[PDB]
């Protein structure tokens, strides 16, 4: 199937940017703190429309000329997208570092406030700390709100970069039809 290579181009050169950000969110969501807070951050993270569908909309008509040009000029397309991707990753790296660094600061503050309570509760720590997952807990609600704020801010920050990568990939494929 010739469409497999088209999908692989998006998965490797435009989708890898957003999947990198998902790893940063999932690192803290699945940690000890995330389990204790009952965090649900990845419930609504996938795009409603996949990037492959967006590429097909911009390239409605297709002819054998495009496929012939694709085979000849995939090497040039692959090299250009790889160079552009490296530029974006380095440019967005400080924001990703900022996202992880500011999050890790909250983890240190949280741990020093809950570890003393675990010793005090003794055998009751398992069930008493379940209140931290409910609405009445001030810190638990604050952590969940800050968790949503950080992940949504990260998603909107790299969204223009993913659109720019997809636009260049669409423009490169559009030029092959002529």
């Amino acid at each position, epitope marked *: 199937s010739p469409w497999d290579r088209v999908k692989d181009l998006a998965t490797v050169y435009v989708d890898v940017l957003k999947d990198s950000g998902r790893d940063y969110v999932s690192q803290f969501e699945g940690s000890a703190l995330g389990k204790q807070l009952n965090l649900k951050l990845l419930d609504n993270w996938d795009s409603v429309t996949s990037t492959f569908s967006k590429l097909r909309e911009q390239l409605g008509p297709v002819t054998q000329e495009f496929w012939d040009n694709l085979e000849k000029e995939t090497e040039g397309l692959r090299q250009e997208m790889s160079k552009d991707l490296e530029e974006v990753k380095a440019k967005v790296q400080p924001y990703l570092d900022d996202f992880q660094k500011k999050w890790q600061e909250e983890m240190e503050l949280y741990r020093q406030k809950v570890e003393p309570l675990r010793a005090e509760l003794q055998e009751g720590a398992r069930q008493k700390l379940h209140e931290l997952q409910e609405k*009445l807990s*001030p810190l638990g609600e604050e952590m969940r709100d800050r968790a949503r704020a950080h992940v949504d801010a990260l998603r909107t920050h790299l969204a223009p970069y993913s659109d720019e990568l997809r636009q260049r990939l669409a423009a490169r494929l559009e030029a092959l039809k002529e």
Partner: antibody
Amino acid sequence: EVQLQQSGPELVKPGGSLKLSCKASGXXXXXXXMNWVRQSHGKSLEWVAXXXXXXXXXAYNQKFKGKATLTVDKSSSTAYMELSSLTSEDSAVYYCARXXXXXXXXXXXXXXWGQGTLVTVSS
Amino acid sequence: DIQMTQSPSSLSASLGETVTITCXXXXXXXXXXXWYQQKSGQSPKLLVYXXXXXXXGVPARFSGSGSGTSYSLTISSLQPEDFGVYYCXXXXXXXXFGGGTKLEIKR
């Protein structure tokens, strides 16, 4: 230091309504849950309800499930308690006390107490 | 929905005499119990939390213990400041208080 300032004594006629004030200072109002305790003259302390200042969630006991209503004003950092259709039996002293937990838990020990507001109902 | 019951409704003891106040729980509380000391015409003050951890400024005379469902508060050598009213509270479920114990000087 951390302290809670309550309103002065209140006189309400039978069948009327009442609203108490509890101003917090020296700490983060939204950081800890706020409790209300009712004590009649020469009687035991009675837990009324609790309020999460950050979110507004309220937890009432069976005695004051519908008779009492708890609200919070984030901007003024004050907690309010409201009683509906007071009677002579409602004449007591009402305290507001902050939960000792730093937001980790809602129901815990009461760290700092307010001086209390005296409530007397008479026509 | 757990009720605290204190056996001594009112106790009179001389200065320096040992006295024990017992707080009974309708169900298992897994520690998380507090005692409050209230003076005449005064607000309650936290005395001991977690049923065994004395608060700041509390003298070593005060002590707490837990043996099953009966939590006990013990004062061995009474002082004039120690006389007043004491209450116990449960912090596991929705908070509740005991019936109260009024301590008075015996002469």
